Amino acid sequence: MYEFKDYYQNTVQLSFDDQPFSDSPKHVWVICRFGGKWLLTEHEDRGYEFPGGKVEPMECAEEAALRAVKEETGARVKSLKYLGQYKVLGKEKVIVKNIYFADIEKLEKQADYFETKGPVLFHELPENLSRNKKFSFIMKDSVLPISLKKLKESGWIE
Ligand SMILES: Nc1nc2c(ncn2[C@@H]2O[C@H](COP(=O)(O)OP(=O)(O)OP(=O)(O)O)[C@@H](O)[C@H]2O)c(=O)[nH]1
């Protein structure tokens, strides 16, 4: 596994095995790709980040991942694939977040933006996200580069 600190100096435990920290994860994170471009969302407070969110009642992690993509980017996933899972050790609460890769089939219109500003398309992600104020803190740690390298080698990009 991988153990490092996040933007707010909280301990993050990253692994690429089939749900090692928890079999019931309360959070999801979806690395989206619309062909040759990265599909991101713009949170009203945080900024630029990959779609994600909490798992709702009578919903599984995979269901929550597809919903978060539609709720934040309004996109339909062609193939959702489990990449890994991470544990964030905060001051009081501990969060178990599931990492998913979504190959985007299409981008459709949305009626409401759930704390978001709609879909965002990037041909290539900026050189330093930890310095970039337009991006979210969830993009400003080692979870993002390690996952992209694993994703690269998966490799389902092509
Ligand atoms: N590093 C990192 N920390 C995260 C991520 N998502 C959430 N956190 C941390 O999790 C905490 C917030 O978790 P939430 O689930 O949103 O908690 P909440 O909104 O107060 O309320 P609940 O819905 O009851 O959980 C903060 O300490 C964040 O730093 C993530 O993707 N990466």
Domain made up of 1-158: CATH architecture = Alpha-Beta Complex (3.90)
Report how this structure was experimentally obtained: X-ray
Q: For residue 96, how far is its CA from the centre of ligand 1 (angstroms)?
A: 9
Residues 119/69, Cβ–Cβ less than 8 Å: no
Beta strands in 2-57 (DSSP E): 2-5, 11-15, 27-34, 37-43, 47-49, 52-54
Burial class, 52, CB count within 10 angstroms (exposed 0-12 / middle 13-18 / buried 19+): buried
Ligand 1 in reach of 138 Cβ (< 6 A): yes
CA 158 / ligand 1 centre spacing (Å): 33
**Residue ID of nearest Cα to ligand 1 atom 18:** 93
Q: What is the DSSP letter of 73?
A: T
| 141 C-beta closer than 6 A to ligand 1 | yes
Contact predicate 28/97, CB 8 Å: yes
* Exposed/middle/buried for residue 93 (C-beta within 10 Å: 0-12, 13-18, 19+): exposed
Is the Cβ–Cβ distance between 54 and 124 less than 8 Å? no
- Residue 90 Cα: closest atom of ligand 1: 27
Alpha carbon distance 23, 28 (integer Å): 13
DSSP H helical ranges for 6-131 = 61-72
List the structure tokens of 34.
């619309």
Residues 104, 77 contacting (CB under 8 angstroms): yes
Beta-ladder partners of 52: 29
Q: Note whether 84 and 99 are within 8 A (CB).
A: yes
Sign of CA dihedral 154, 119, 141, 29: negative
Determine the atom of ligand 1 nearest the C-alpha atom of 26: 15
Question: What gap in Å lies between CA 136 and CA 98, rounded to an integer?
Answer: 18
| Domain spans of the chain, in order of start | 1-158
